[PDB]
Amino acid sequence: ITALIVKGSNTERFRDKMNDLISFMNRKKLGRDLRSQITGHVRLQYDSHYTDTVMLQDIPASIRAKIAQLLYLPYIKKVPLFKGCSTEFINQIVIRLHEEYFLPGEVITEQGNVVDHLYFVCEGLLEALVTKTDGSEESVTLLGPHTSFGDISIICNISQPFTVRVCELCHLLRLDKQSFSNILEIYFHDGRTILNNIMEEKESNDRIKKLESDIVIHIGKQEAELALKVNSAAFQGDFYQLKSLIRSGADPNKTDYDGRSPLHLAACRGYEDITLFLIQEGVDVNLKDKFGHTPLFEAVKAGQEGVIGLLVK
Amino acid sequence: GHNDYKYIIHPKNRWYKAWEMFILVWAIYSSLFTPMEFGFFRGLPERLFVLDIVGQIAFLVDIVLQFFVAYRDTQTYRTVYKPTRIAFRYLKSHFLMDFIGCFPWDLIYKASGKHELVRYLLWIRLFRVRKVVEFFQRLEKDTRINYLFTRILKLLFVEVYCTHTAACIFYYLATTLPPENEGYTWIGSLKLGDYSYENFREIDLWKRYTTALYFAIVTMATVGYGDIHAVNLREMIFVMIYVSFDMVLGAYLIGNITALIVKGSNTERFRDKMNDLISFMNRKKLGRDLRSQITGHVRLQYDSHYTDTVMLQDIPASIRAKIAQLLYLPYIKKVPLFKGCSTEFINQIVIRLHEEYFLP
Amino acid sequence: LKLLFVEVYCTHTAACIFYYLATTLPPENEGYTWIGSLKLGDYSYENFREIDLWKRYTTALYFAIVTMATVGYGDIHAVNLREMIFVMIYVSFDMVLGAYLIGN
Amino acid sequence: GEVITEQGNVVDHLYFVCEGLLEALVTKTDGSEESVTLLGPHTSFGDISIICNISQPFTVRVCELCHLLRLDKQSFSNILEIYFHDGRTILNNIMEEKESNDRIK
Amino acid sequence: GEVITEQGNVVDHLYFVCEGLLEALVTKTDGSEESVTLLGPHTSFGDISIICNISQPFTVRVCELCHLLRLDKQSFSNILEIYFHDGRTILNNIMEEKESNDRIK
């Protein structure tokens, strides 16, 4: 019987963790309001025991991704942002998601703040109050289940458009802003899907403010970057990324804003590997930039005798 | 401000809290007196009429009030103010037993030709102990009292209540036999000292109750003097049941007390560290200054709660942020290394910032 | 050691209080006290107020020590209602004390 | 079936495949695994990334009961730097091994 | 009865004898180990091969409860590199006390 008691009960662990928290709060003089919020949140972790993912921490990341693709996957499929997006993008979002539960009344994000976390609303009701210039907050949308907030702010690189408050115990799937941006960059095609989804969302009911004007920015920028990335990797010397960039898209004959193909920069910087790879791509060897310069001229001007010979042959 | 109703009162209202404590005291008394009302009386005397009527009135108004008290929904975590939802919850949860216990069972017993089976329904009022259980569970979530200590005070209340109930049931079992077979009952064959409990139905209620509760308490600690013991077979069966159940109850009591003193305390754990350290301090004959340095190490290790850094590793990122940018942020804002940096970069620095303390 | 000292002290005090509650009753009706009705062996504690001090103390402390370990021989028992009440209180308190001893 | 080391991540743990077969694949951005090597018993991986301080070129995932012998990045480097000499003439030989791979450039 | 270092093995740790009796033994090819000396308190071993950089000169075998202070080879080498004059004084002490062992290198 004593062993059974000493093994511990859920409320006993609640008591210990809460008392530790109260020690830390009082000693750091957090403040009545903040003490109330943190106590409420961890009390939530102890009433619903949603922080049962601690066992998950032991289970390795591959199996964790599998459990993620069994639990978080349906909601993220339903998410309006990830409509028509590639399965790989969906999976990467699911793997990087973290479960959270927020008690009613809690202000998750505040209008004007930097959105460091993009939340997927899964099981709950929230609010989208806009803190106007006067300060009155009108509920833009109820942001019901299977939705997302923090998303337009992260992608459009604008501050938080509206304050989000909790109506009912909400099961949010949090995603770090930086992880979202990295996944967005790594899959540029799925990013294109996100941006057209954002634009078609404007044609739909997304109750957004001001103007987004980013799909067209993405149409220009994704392609212009990918070409630039090719040229910049050539100039820096990143042959390894250059192969992947050429295979991903654009064209090894693509030129920059000044009309410089990657061969020009590879010749100037004396990179025989990149120069050879462009040779197998059949890149123009007499292509001339806005300043009337051929890659042979750049190889000679920099005295890259090996690259000079490669271009001469 | 969602209390548009002038009838539903918030469950944390001060006046309703005072009523809750009042009905807790009445629940304690009524649940302690129901075994006494059942065992030691075959029908209440005229002296206790007003007490009985007033008690059931006090619990009936509690039944009435429970339809006007908001309850925090366990799926939406907001105080449901809807009167029909509140009434539905109370009617389906514990309304029937409160209502049945609120019947004047003594007057019904006397009215129904003095039938013992009617009096056997007095044990429905035992379900008023739900109030006491609720009070204890409310204490255990309140962090001003140690949980295990509350879990043992609850077990002490359970033990007090089981002894009182067992004493009443034991004397009732004595009364079940006709007064002609008094010599075959546990109390009717009692000759403690020179006093003989021959006609035990005529002795004053407190003498009988003190004797029966003496039996219950001494058997609760298994002292078993033997001066008082079972005689009938109904008494053997009841004593066997009570003794077998009390074995497990006392074992659980010992287990809970051992839980308190085995879990230990921060003082105890640090003291164990000190015992080991200061012992090493002595075996090697360390200089008192070096000893002071080591003692200062451990002293700051727990005193600045240096161990206490990762409790909030489970609080969500929003609150984790607010804590960090309300505690570590000012220093970083004034650090010349990050002078001129974006506030968001400083926020990221502060989020993963660790705390450490160093002695001179 | 604190619990052992507390338990020993409580036994001694309980024995003294037990004997005192035996003395509260008038000497005429001593047959209703725990010591006045004692017939241990062939020796009867008849004039319990005239016995040697150490016999009285050893009998009272025997009862206290026995009930402290809850042996409950039964030869000495709370005959009075006041004796019963005191034995009830002691026994209930010592159960918690012994549980604390086992836990420590 | 569990990934040991992930491509695009600087390896901080050199593993010695000693029992059980491991499989090394560079999964493409479209989700297509490309098994580049099959590291059986008495093989090593991660060493390129640590010696280079580059990211892992191929994600390595387990295929049988792979009894491996992990060696930390700081541990290895130390055996060469912190354990000077232990990591000078000998590591030069290790560099000869890596250049004799003939793919490392 | 235990052996600390065996004559011929590469020294990885320099040991100092605080208390207890150790025995340095030259194991010849005759099936026997000539007892070079009985290393006592305040002596040291694993230093001849850590300074003269040679193979362990004698098998050090335990005979009592020896409370040995151990110094890692790398650590000692690093400290010698930092403190060159102290290494001088040490090497001086080696040559002045070359009468300690006849088979000393």
Residue numbers in the entry:
A (entry chain C): 306 to 618
B (entry chain B): 50 to 409
C (entry chain D): 202 to 305
D (entry chain A), E (entry chain D): 410 to 514
Report text from the authors:
The potassium ion efflux channel GORK plays a critical role in closing plant leaf stomata by releasing K+ from guard cells to reduce guard cell volume and turgor. The GUARD CELL OUTWARD-RECTIFYING K+ (GORK) channel is expressed in Arabidopsis guard cells and encodes a K+out channel. Voltage-dependent K+ channels, including GORK, contain three regions: an intracellular N-terminal region, a transmembrane region, and an intracellular C-terminal region (27–30). The transmembrane region is composed of six transmembrane helices (S1-S6), with S1-S4 forming the voltage sensing domain and S5 and S6 forming the pore region.
As a result, five different structures of GORK ranging from the transmembrane region to the C-terminal ANK (designated as GORKWT1–GORKWT5) were determined at resolutions of 3.16 to 3.27 Å. The five GORK structures showed N-terminally an almost uniform transmembrane domain (positions 50 to 313 from the initial Met), including the voltage-sensing domain and the ion selectivity filter. In contrast, the following cytosolic regions, i.e., C-linker (positions 314 to 364), CNBD (positions 365 to 490), CNBD–Ankyrin bridge (positions 491 to 542), and ANK (positions 543 to 722) show five distinct structures in almost twofold symmetry (C2 symmetry). Furthermore, overlaying GORKWT1 and GORKWT5, which had high resolutions of 3.17 and 3.16 Å, respectively, revealed that one of the C-linkers in each dimer was pushed upward by the CNBD in GORKWT1, as compared to GORKWT5. Closer inspection of the structure revealed that the difference of the degree of bending in the C-linker between Mol I and Mol II was small in GORKWT1 but greater in GORKWT5. Additionally, GORKWT1 displayed a C4-like C2 symmetry in the CNBD, whereas GORKWT5 showed a pronounced C2 symmetry. Furthermore, we found a structural difference in the short structure that lies between the CNBD and ANK domains, termed as CNBD–Ankyrin bridge containing residues 511 to 519. This region had an α-helical structure in GORKWT1, while in GORKWT5, it was entirely present in a nonhelical loop conformation. The CNBD–Ankyrin bridges of GORKWT1–GORKWT5 contain a mixture of α-helical and nonhelical structures, and these conformational changes appear to be centered around L516.
